[PDB]
Amino acid sequence: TIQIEFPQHSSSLLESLNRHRLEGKFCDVSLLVQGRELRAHKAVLAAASPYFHDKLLLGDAPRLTLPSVIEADAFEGLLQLIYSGRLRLPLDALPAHLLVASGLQMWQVVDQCSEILRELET
Amino acid sequence: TIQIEFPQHSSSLLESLNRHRLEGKFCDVSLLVQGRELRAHKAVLAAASPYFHDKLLLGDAPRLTLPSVIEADAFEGLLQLIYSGRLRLPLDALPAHLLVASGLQMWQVVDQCSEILRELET
Amino acid sequence: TIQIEFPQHSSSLLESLNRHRLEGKFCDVSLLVQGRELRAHKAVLAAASPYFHDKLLLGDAPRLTLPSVIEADAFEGLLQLIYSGRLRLPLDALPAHLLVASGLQMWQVVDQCSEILRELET
Amino acid sequence: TIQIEFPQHSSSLLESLNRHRLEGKFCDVSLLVQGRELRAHKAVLAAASPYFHDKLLLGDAPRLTLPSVIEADAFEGLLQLIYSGRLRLPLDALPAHLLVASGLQMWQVVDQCSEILRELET
Amino acid sequence: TIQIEFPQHSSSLLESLNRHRLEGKFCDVSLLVQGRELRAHKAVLAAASPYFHDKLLLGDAPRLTLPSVIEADAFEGLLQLIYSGRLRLPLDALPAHLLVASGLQMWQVVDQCSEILRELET
Amino acid sequence: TIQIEFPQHSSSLLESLNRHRLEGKFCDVSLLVQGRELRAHKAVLAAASPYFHDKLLLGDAPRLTLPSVIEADAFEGLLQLIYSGRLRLPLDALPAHLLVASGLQMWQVVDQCSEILRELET
Amino acid sequence: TIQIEFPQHSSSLLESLNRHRLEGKFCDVSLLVQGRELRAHKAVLAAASPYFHDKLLLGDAPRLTLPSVIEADAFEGLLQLIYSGRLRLPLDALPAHLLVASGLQMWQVVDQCSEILRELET
Amino acid sequence: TIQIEFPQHSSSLLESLNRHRLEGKFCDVSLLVQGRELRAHKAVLAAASPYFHDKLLLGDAPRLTLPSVIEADAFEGLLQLIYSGRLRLPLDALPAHLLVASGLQMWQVVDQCSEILRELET
Amino acid sequence: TIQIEFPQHSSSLLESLNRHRLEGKFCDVSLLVQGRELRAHKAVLAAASPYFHDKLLLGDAPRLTLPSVIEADAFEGLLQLIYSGRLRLPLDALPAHLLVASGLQMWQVVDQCSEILRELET
Amino acid sequence: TIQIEFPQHSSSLLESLNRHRLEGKFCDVSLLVQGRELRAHKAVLAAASPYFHDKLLLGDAPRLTLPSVIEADAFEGLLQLIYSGRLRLPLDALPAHLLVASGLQMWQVVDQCSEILRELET
Amino acid sequence: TIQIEFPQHSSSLLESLNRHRLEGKFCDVSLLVQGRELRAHKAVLAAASPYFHDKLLLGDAPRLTLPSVIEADAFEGLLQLIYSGRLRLPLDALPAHLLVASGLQMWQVVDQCSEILRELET
Amino acid sequence: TIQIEFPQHSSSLLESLNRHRLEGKFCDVSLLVQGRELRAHKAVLAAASPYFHDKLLLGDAPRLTLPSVIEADAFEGLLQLIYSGRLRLPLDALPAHLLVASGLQMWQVVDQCSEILRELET
Amino acid sequence: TIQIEFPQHSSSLLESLNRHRLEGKFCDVSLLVQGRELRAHKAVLAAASPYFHDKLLLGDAPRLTLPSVIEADAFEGLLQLIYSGRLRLPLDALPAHLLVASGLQMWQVVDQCSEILRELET
Amino acid sequence: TIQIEFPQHSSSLLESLNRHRLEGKFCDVSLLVQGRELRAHKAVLAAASPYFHDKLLLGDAPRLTLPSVIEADAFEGLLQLIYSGRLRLPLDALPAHLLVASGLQMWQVVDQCSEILRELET
């Protein structure tokens, strides 16, 4: 019996996924955030975000309008993180991003961001 | 046709429910937060919190263990707010509560807390 | 310390709960009135009616059949009031409803209905 | 600017994806292979296999019947690899799996399998 | 009404066209395989291979560079088969050729080659 | 050594090509016959007709207008024969079709048609 | 400025050419038609017939064997027409000549012959 | 018996021949005149000029160099006349052209040119 | 070895030949020019004129009738030149003589005559 | 009045004649000398030799066989002189050559040769 | 039948004729040779010498002057031979005499003399 | 000193002379005998007969008519004898011939004929 | 005018002449015939025979010796005839006499003698 | 024996004699008569006249001078008679002639003349 592992398979898959998202390829849902329309694929969002998970499980709408409180720019940063595992932002935007991240129930990211804010205050 | 309105009907009912929860009466769910057990009623929590609502809609467990990141004290303050509409806390504790509130999708409360924090910064 | 109040939180919550009851969501008790089955939530009924309160405290049955003397129409009107705060009925049906209200120990409602009946008599 | 990386994020997401495939949640395509019906999600298949990518891009059918030459068992093993990054199989089944893998255009895997077969030959 | 059929019409057309290719006449696409350039006609390749058909439908490039994993000798033998219906190769090269055929989705040929390999093993 | 032959393979490929011509897919030339525009594939026409063969060999025009003397209906019958090997026509139209065939240098068909006309005379 | 025109220059030149033909002078190509060998000049044939034009442009053979279907006598009549502009033939031989004319792509002549046949029919 | 005449057949044919000469198509002889090389077709020249007839009959050279006394410009004018039946030249160049015409033994043209020169003198 | 030269041998021989011609001795050809009969020797004419060489190689006729366009007097002057190397003529007859000279292809004489005409024009 | 002289005209004509001889062109008499047959032109011989002049005037035979006493080599040298004006020979052969010259009545040549013999004697 | 022959008849005739010539009787031609006048009979001279024969056949002059190169003494010796068949001369004069004989074409004697000269050189 | 004699020189000369007479060449006298005109050479006749010598000395007439008594046939026999040395005649004509011979003073011939006649008489 | 004729004058004169001859009177010539000397008168002989006349005009010799063939007796008989006009001879001597008469040119006598011999033969 | 007579022999001989005398041929004597010189032959005169006979036999002089009394004219007439036998004279001259006849002793003539004179006187 054989076991094969490709450590960078996942990273390549995520890069290609993000690329297609940018290319607008195979996107099946449109997200309206403060008037900004962003296309994405439902399965990845549901698998990545428990909020989106339940959202999809309960409602099969091709378009989802997010709460007005959710900032479009912060949402774009978290979407980039979702499709890259990386987040670059200005310091002053950390709270807003953090806030939205909490709304998406991303507790590992919330933990790290809270740790970073605490480190900054100290 | 006659019209009757009870402005304090809702407040009286909420107070009754709150006191019931306090005494442990008819509580049907137990919430574990960092080792702290807090009893509450599933219907009230689902009706008040979309997060709680979908969670219940998806899982009918008498006991729910919250993410370790959720602090017991902030959660207890938010629960008393849920069952009273009022929140009293120290200034320095405003962030933590806010974090938890965002996880529970209380967008009016999140807005108010963010505005207050911004006012404090100024 | 900050204090936040949302005057319409309770009313919106009661509207949502009423819709759920109609939608049959999370309803945990079935009320049989003269052969007619009407679904409702045990917690709401106990909180609203001291009669139901004690009844549930003593008996945890998913189905409750009320005495045959209780008219179905009065019961649905009172249920609409309980889950909406509103009651619309024909004048001649006021006594029956009143009677049922007394059985539910709604003394504010019983008082107001008696006053209205007295006004009609005068 | 801060940079956060979660090496086990992709693995966890893949696990969740596989679990969903198993439980039939959010599956949007049914694949018929030698009379065997297997549910899966179109986006993951397109992102993982260039063959699937093209197939879906050209045809949005909820059901896809693969060529009869594709074995159901080999296809299910490769699907497990797709959703886990691991493949365990009997030695004698390696060619068939390999064959299907070539049809799925998994060239890294094809390279590794050819190397392993060569090692067996030596 | 009359019906005329020419059984060898198709074969004569395929031989003439194959020779034209060998003569480099009317070839409209150039295939780069491991540094080797091979001229061919887009219509015949698209009509014969679904893989090539799809690639053409998606991209009208006069030059197509094939994946490095595709071996030049197997590809030239398979090109000879496509343009002649005949394939002569050494026994030990059968897997590689087979492999390429799978990438080109020649499933009848893949079946026949797998059967031949199986008989050889016995 | 193995030999594989597919008697119905070339015919099927031709059928696919004809279907494409019908639906307008991959057609690269437009033929003007008495004001009627007809789409077709240059390679098929050159391979099938030596007249059209040299015509294309000498002139790479996307549009070719045939002499006005060429009848549209006769040309459509001959094109159907070219892409199907079958011709259905009224008896009285046999001369015109024959005429066009000579211009297209279809000498087998011309032979058969001359034999048939002679048979008709007898 | 002066303008000189010789209306019978062309006719006299054609006469000289035909004279050379009958004497076999300067003929550079030999045409085999049903076993009959006929000498002729390549340039005149190419200039007069598009078929011959292309044939010569493609193949510079001193001898060209025509298809067996082409009748020798009809071909000699058409060659005489080519070299004189006049054609005298028996009525019953008109079809064959016409046929050959179509093969030689003399479309004005084909038109005239079809008109004459129609006139005979009427 | 029928007789068909196409008065402009010859002129169109001559036009085609001249056009081919211009392009260099089917030209079989190269004429060197005072160091200037001009391609042309042997048959047309022999048929048009008795001098060319004789010269060709006596010598089968692909290249013919004319006497140095023959001016190149007059020769191209006479060649265009040969292939068109028309001659345009400056008045003062009329003698030179005439001279060359005599060498080519075109006595009708010589007669007309002498007559025109005489008319100019008068 | 000795070398003897007779510079006037050729001139004396020419004189003798011309005298013989005048006396009609050994004359073997009769030239008809516009009805005028002139006797001469074929060999001298062929050696002097390339046209005569050609004509004799092509035709052994004791009598040759030249084209009517050739004037008898110009021909007699040119014959005198041929048999003497000297030509005296009136100026106005130079073209006609010149014309005839061109027909006889005496290009040195043509050169000289063209030079004299050009000098006269200047 | 003009007079034209060509000093090398005679020499060029005689070279052309001799070349024709060497080429066997236009020779009209055959001379048999000691079994060797040599072709030549009657007019040239008559003009050059008085003996031959008379011979031809009297007998128009295409073949003349001279008495054997005439040496073939001497005759060939004298004929070369006739057609060139030059004679190269060995000293010891001078008498024989002289003899033949006398038979042909070449009195200038005989005189020169006798004078040369006298110089040799001195 | 009788046959009479007179072998010395001819010799008597010859001697008589020679005597006549000597006395100057019946001589009908006078020959001028280098200023020496010698009388002779035309018939004998024509019968004996081809040269003289032709000369007379063409010119009936009572006096013939020979070329100055012909020596008078050699001619008189040769004339004596002509009228006697015998020649006596000095050795050194043999060439000159030979020469004259050749001019008169007395082949037999000319040859005899060449043999004698050859004998002398040997 | 050498002496050359040619025994058949005289006979050859006489035969040639007789032949020349037959062809009528150089005959200078015409003899009229009984109305028959016969051409001959005066010199031969004068040289052979003394009577002829005399007649010539006395009269230089181109024509001589002999006395009628001389028969033409005998004269022809004697003339052939004169020019040949041979005589063929019928026996009975010997006297007549003899008679003429006597008139011509042929005393040797008369002697021979008389001897032959005497032999006949004996 | 008177005319006198004496028929016998001539005969008497001839008698006197003959007598003088017999007497040797006035004889001026001596004739030697076969050794026999006979005197006679030159004038008579010349006047009677033309041959005599001629010979005498040619030679004034007092003695003439005749050819040996002339018989003395025949000569004397003919001489007596000359001087008498009468001839008596033996028959057998008629030829000899005839012979001499012919040599002497006596043609009247020759005619008569030939007639007499012929009469004898008949 | 034969006898031949020629009656006109004498007359022909005498006419020839007379004619020769006129021509002065063979005349050997000159007669001087009164200054007139007349040539004649001695033999004829001696034979005809006895006077002349005597004159000659006695004197052999080439010239004879007659007596002066003899008239020249009469002598010439008598000489004509001697050579003709005829005499024509005027009547009055008859005596003189007679006288001369007497001197010549012509007694027959004298007799005849006397008879004629007597006839005249009578």
Side-chain angles (χ1 to χ4, degrees), chain D residues 5-81:
Chain D
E5 300 316 313
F6 297 101
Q8 66 295 345
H9 70 257
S10 301
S11 57
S12 305
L13 190 62
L14 175 55
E15 170 282 332
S16 166
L17 163 75
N18 199 356
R19 169 189 42 80
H20 284 285
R21 188 283 175 184
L22 163 143
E23 51 211 14
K25 291 297 103 171
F26 313 105
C27 296
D28 56 3
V29 62
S30 189
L31 301 173
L32 191 64
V33 190
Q34 297 184 333
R36 185 185 305 175
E37 188 178 358
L38 303 165
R39 295 202 66 184
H41 192 268
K42 290 172 182 171
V44 61
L45 298 173
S49 163
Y51 180 80
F52 271 95
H53 166 278
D54 185 74
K55 183 57 178 180
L56 305 182
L57 181 58
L58 304 175
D60 291 331
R63 181 173 285 239
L64 282 297
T65 305
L66 280 296
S68 59
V69 68
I70 293 302
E71 298 80 0
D73 299 67
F75 167 79
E76 198 62 350
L78 285 173
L79 183 59
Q80 186 184 6
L81 172 83

Side-chain angles (χ1 to χ4, degrees), chain J residues 37-112:
Chain J
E37 190 52 70
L38 304 166
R39 295 202 66 184
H41 185 86
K42 290 173 181 171
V44 180
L45 301 171
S49 167
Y51 150 73
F52 276 102
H53 173 258
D54 295 337
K55 190 61 178 179
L56 300 182
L57 186 55
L58 273 294
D60 291 331
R63 74 282 190 191
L64 289 176
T65 305
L66 279 296
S68 62
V69 93
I70 295 300
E71 298 80 0
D73 62 333
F75 175 77
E76 280 281 5
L78 189 170
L79 182 59
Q80 186 184 6
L81 174 142
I82 285 168
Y83 282 81
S84 67
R86 159 58 189 164
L87 182 63
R88 195 174 181 106
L89 69 161
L91 74 169
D92 58 1
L94 187 153
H97 288 72
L98 174 67
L99 296 174
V100 304
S102 61
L104 299 178
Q105 305 176 14
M106 296 297 101
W107 306 130
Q108 296 79 5
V109 183
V110 173
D111 188 358
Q112 197 61 22

Side-chain angles (χ1 to χ4, degrees), chain C residues 4 13 15 17-18 23-24 37 40-41 43 49 58 64 76 78 80 90 92 102 117 121:
Chain C
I4 306 172
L13 190 63
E15 184 277 332
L17 297 175
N18 188 356
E23 298 163 336
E37 188 178 359
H41 307 87
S49 164
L58 305 172
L64 288 68
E76 293 97 6
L78 286 173
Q80 186 184 6
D92 291 331
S102 189
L117 171 159
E121 289 169 0

Side-chain angles (χ1 to χ4, degrees), chain E residues 27 46 51 53 80 87 95 97 112 118 121:
Chain E
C27 295
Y51 179 79
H53 181 254
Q80 186 184 6
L87 181 64
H97 287 72
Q112 197 61 22
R118 206 189 140 173
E121 180 63 0

Side-chain angles (χ1 to χ4, degrees), chain F residues 46-118:
Chain F
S49 164
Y51 180 78
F52 271 133
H53 187 273
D54 46 352
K55 302 261 288 180
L56 182 62
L57 187 58
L58 61 85
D60 190 1
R63 182 173 286 238
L64 169 57
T65 305
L66 279 296
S68 298
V69 71
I70 297 299
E71 298 81 0
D73 63 357
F75 176 78
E76 288 292 330
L78 290 174
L79 182 59
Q80 186 184 6
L81 172 150
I82 286 168
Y83 282 81
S84 67
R86 294 191 275 165
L87 181 64
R88 312 291 289 168
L89 69 161
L91 61 78
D92 58 1
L94 184 57
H97 288 72
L98 174 67
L99 296 174
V100 181
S102 189
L104 299 178
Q105 304 175 14
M106 296 298 102
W107 306 130
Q108 307 79 5
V109 183
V110 173
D111 292 315
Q112 197 60 22
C113 293
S114 58
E115 194 184 0
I116 294 167
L117 286 167
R118 206 188 140 172

Side-chain angles (χ1 to χ4, degrees), chain L residues 72-88:
Chain L
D73 63 357
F75 168 79
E76 289 283 5
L78 284 74
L79 185 153
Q80 59 82 214
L81 172 83
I82 285 168
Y83 283 81
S84 67
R86 294 192 275 165
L87 61 77
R88 194 60 270 159

Side-chain angles (χ1 to χ4, degrees), chain A residues 1-6 8-11 13-14 16-17 20 25-26 28 41 43-44 46-48 53 56-57 81 84-90 94 108-109 112 116, chain D residues 1-6 8-11 13-14 16-17 19-20 25-26 28 41-43 46-48 53 56-57 81 84-89 94 108-109 112 116:
Chain A
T1 48
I2 57 172
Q3 177 164 344
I4 187 57
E5 301 295 359
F6 296 100
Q8 65 295 345
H9 65 252
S10 307
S11 58
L13 294 172
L14 183 56
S16 177
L17 285 162
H20 281 86
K25 291 299 291 295
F26 313 105
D28 57 3
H41 209 123
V44 54
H53 181 257
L56 182 63
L57 193 53
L81 201 174
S84 67
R86 178 67 178 87
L87 182 63
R88 195 174 181 106
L89 69 161
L94 186 52
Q108 204 184 185
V109 179
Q112 198 60 22
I116 296 299
Chain D
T1 48
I2 50 173
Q3 176 163 344
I4 189 55
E5 300 316 313
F6 297 101
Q8 66 295 345
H9 70 257
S10 301
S11 57
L13 190 62
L14 175 55
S16 166
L17 163 75
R19 169 189 42 80
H20 284 285
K25 291 297 103 171
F26 313 105
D28 56 3
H41 192 268
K42 290 172 182 171
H53 166 278
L56 305 182
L57 181 58
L81 172 83
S84 67
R86 294 192 275 165
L87 181 64
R88 194 174 181 106
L89 69 161
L94 186 52
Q108 203 184 5
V109 183
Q112 197 60 22
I116 296 299

